[PDB]
Specification:
Distance between the termini: 45 Å
Subcellular location: Cytoplasm, Cytoskeleton; Cell junction, Focal adhesion; Cytoplasm, Cell cortex
Largest sheet: 2 strands, antiparallel
Number of strands: 4
Function: Cytoskeletal protein involved in actin-membrane attachment at sites of cell adhesion to the extracellular matrix (focal adhesion). Recruits other proteins such as TRIM15 to focal adhesion.
Shape: elongated
Radius of gyration: 12 Å
Protein name: Paxillin
Oligomer: monomer
CATH class: Mainly Beta
CATH topology: Cysteine Rich Protein
Bound molecules: zinc ion
Helix content: 10-25%
Modified residues (Phosphoserine): 7
Family: Belongs to the paxillin family.
Number of domains: 1
CATH architecture: Ribbon
């Protein structure tokens, strides 16, 4: 069986069995947590956020700078 809950991946509304990203309290499957700009892919390890949405540090560095 998985863990106790699994945390729903914001966007999937389904538990995250395995690694899990935690944004503004919103979770995301480590593969569904993408940049709210290019939507290519994203990781809390080095992402950024603006207007309440994720953005790769390179993106934020491109949008915010
Ligand atoms: Zn998901
Ligand atoms: Zn991006």
């Amino acid at each position: 069986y998985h863990e106790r809950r699994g945390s729903l991946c914001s966007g999937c509304q389904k538990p995250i069995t395995g690694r899990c990203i935690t944004a503004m309290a919103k979770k995301f499957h480590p593969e569904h947590f993408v940049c709210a700009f290019c939507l290519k892919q994203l990781n809390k390890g080095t992402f950024k956020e603006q207007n309440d949405k994720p953005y790769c540090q390179n993106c934020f560095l491109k949008l915010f700078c």
